Write a protein that binds this DNA or RNA. Sequence first.
DNA 1: GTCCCTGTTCGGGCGCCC
DNA 2: GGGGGGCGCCCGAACAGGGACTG
Lengths: 545, 394
Amino acid sequence: PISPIETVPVKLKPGMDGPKVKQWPLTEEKIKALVEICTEMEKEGKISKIGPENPYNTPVFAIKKKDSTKWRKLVDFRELNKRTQDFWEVQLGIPHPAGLKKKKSVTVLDVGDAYFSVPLDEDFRKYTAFTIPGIRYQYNVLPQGWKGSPAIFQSSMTKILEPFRKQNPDIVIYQYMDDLYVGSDLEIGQHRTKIEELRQHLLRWGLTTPDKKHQKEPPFLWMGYELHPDKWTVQPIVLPEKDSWTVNDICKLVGKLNWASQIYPGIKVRQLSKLLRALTEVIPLTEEAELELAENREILKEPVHGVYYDPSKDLIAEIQKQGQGQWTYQIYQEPFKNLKTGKYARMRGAHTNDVKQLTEAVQKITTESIVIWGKTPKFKLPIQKETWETWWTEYWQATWIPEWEFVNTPPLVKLWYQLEKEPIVGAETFYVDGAANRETKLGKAGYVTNRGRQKVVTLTDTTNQKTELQAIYLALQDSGLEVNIVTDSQYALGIIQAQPDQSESELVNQIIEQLIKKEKVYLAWVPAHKGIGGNEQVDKLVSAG
Amino acid sequence: IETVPVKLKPGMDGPKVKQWPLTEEKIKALVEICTEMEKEGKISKIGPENPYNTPVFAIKKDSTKWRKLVDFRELNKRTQDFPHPAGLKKKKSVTVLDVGDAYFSVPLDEDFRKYTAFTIPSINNETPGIRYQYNVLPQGWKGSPAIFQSSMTKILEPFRKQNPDIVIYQYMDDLYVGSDLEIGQHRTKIEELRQHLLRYELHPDKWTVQPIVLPEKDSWTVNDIQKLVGKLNWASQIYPGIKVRQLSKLLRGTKALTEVIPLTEEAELELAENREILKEPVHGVYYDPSKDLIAEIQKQGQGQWTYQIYQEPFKNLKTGKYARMHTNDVKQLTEAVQKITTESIVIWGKTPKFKLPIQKETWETWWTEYWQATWIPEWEFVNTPPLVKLWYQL
DNA sequence: GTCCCTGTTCGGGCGCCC
DNA sequence: GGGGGGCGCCCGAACAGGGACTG
Ligand SMILES: Nc1ccn([C@H]2C[C@H](O)[C@@H](COP(=O)(O)OP(=O)(O)OP(=O)(O)O)O2)c(=O)n1
Ligand SMILES: [Mg+2]
């Protein structure tokens, strides 16, 4: 049946016209599938035969549904989609079972042939012209393949449920496309009554709810999960086992894993992701990668569930450090009863350290808790209050972590060295510098010390900033456990003062090692070329090119 | 009440900003507020055929009462262009009133409404977003003071006549009311005006400018002098007139950083004159309204924040200090940004563009939890050279 | 001006949902 | 096989912006 909802006014992008595209050849099994579908839709006024008034055409096909049995008619509107106006998508995200509260009674409903129940704007029907190889039709309803269809259906669906929702404020209806999860705190019979009210409300608006997709008993299949009354589970995740992985194969494995990490603690994909730095390209696994893959494989073998959300309790998130910029977290309310889990692993910044990254993790989780439960969680972090305090003093930026409590569970996040705030008495003073020729790429790094030591190192295929980092490296390399280094490189001073423990740069990594080995380091800055000794002396030494 | 046609600047489409996630509290408020706003015809539901969007959130001012706030910064940037009292920055007491509810009485050009579209999120995405659009002058759009200016004049006219010593300035949803009354006098005047409009608190003169100031110590190390020469070399750019040659002459050779250096009497005096060249007011800096105010903020630590407002580099219009205290940097930084904006609106009736010393994500995760203003300045995020933060140190 | 380096965004794969 | 919207993850490509440099 077709909804008596008002159509949504749609137009083409200006100066453009509808699609004219040859109908590619189809399987015979699919044509029988399609005429079966078309002859029926046509009797229901969902599609209309057209003539030569309609110049347009757009290819059609059909794939099998999850069902084994019924076909889904589709239309490669890729071209019309280029030429259709912009919509504002209204689907802002994906409901998560961890955000569901416990309900006395639950129902899951799906709408029968949902799109084909929402009428399409009259003035736009022309462009939806297609051909079944052989009859020529246009759409009077939403086509599956148009880019307007999801936003229009979702919005239309939302209009339709608005009355029921106002009339029934305390019946909760999660609404994903045409899928509905309906929860009530009613005894089973009063609930079933309410469901029948709903189904008939939908029917009045042309959206049927076939009993075949009407779930009445736990466990409910919903949004890719099984929902039990006290716990939820993800429908089994089956990783490939192709012992000759390709870039496409990897991407599917990284994808299934990230999806898996929402309830599986300890998933890592750094070493897998690292691999893919076109799609048919086969890549050899690294050791680190396969070792990882196996670790995940062992994780997935275990049985795990999530729980539902009690708003009367707190949201707690604890974060584990996984190493190499990797982090897992567990969000719960009662210990060892996870709401959900997750991983942070985004590398951002050429140079960084573990406290920045922890702060980024806290941020991601905060944003995500806010989407899912609408509030920030309390944090349990493997970082001592003193460590954070130091970093929030030492750092020239506004940084902040919400309410949180330390947890002794290693690897504890630390600062791996601390630059001195004041120059070090009885420490050799190095005046470092570097210069590099733009044209030849030759350059020199080196230093001059208050004790009379001087050294220049010649470099090849280098850059100015590199030569300044090289000069500092050189000074760390030839200094005692305590060193005063004076640089004129704003660049270098900015990197090192940020106290990184990791870098994309091999050279900065080599430097970090030196800074961790040293016991006191002090970095002072001076303006370049201003006769300031002995930045002056090392400048002459280094600038012979 | 017929409407004023309103255009976008040429070659410019309307805003298309994604809504950010809101807390349950804020959504509950927005839904309640929007319901009532829809009952009174002030907003209408719209579908997804309207391709425009603009974020909304909500602030709680100790109250039971939330305030919707639509982030119209793009729309304002994109709206065809449209009174500044120098005497307002002098008043002993200035009060800020929210005259935003006044705009809901003037309807809005039908062909413009589409660009005011906003979307309300649901907790845990239980539903698609619910999209609205405005039918009256929106609060937070720069068009709403303009269109309503005419009416705004008629309303304050007799209050200004009867109080010609009181100065009333309007910026966006805001009414700035400055008086030279002892507090209480001023207060009773403020409630005289608000009661007059149905039919806390500022003091612009006690505002401070933060000079650049030099260390005073009796023995100087090479390190001390090197930092000093570095600080002055940069201040040379702001104030021509600052000299380092004599001090820089003490850093002849390659000395140990902790060596003490007796100050030669030349250098001793050069350091003295410099000190005064800092207190001397900066020269040759004219506020240009055709260019926006830039504001830099630097975290000085221990709840101390410095800032400078300038239109061109090193040509500061004002330079200040903002001091506070479970210390929260994000909370302090947004309190600073609101403080600096307010001062900027008072002095030049233009909102500044902030260069914020914070990670973009950290700022976007929390700033609305401490916002209290009806306007929102534009901003960009910067990784400030740890040099500049020592230049302005106290 | 150029070159360098760093940060952001955006668009392309893949995952999952309908 | 092949179409669509959403969110997620990774990646690399453009481009933005400040600093250092050439004379
Ligand atoms: N691969 C897919 C799956 C779905 N949809 C859209 C159009 C569908 O109508 C709607 C809902 O999907 P269902 O699987 O519920 O399909 P229908 O509602 O059309 O059919 P059924 O009777 O099998 O439920 O989402 C789509 O465009 N592409
Ligand atoms: Mg269905």
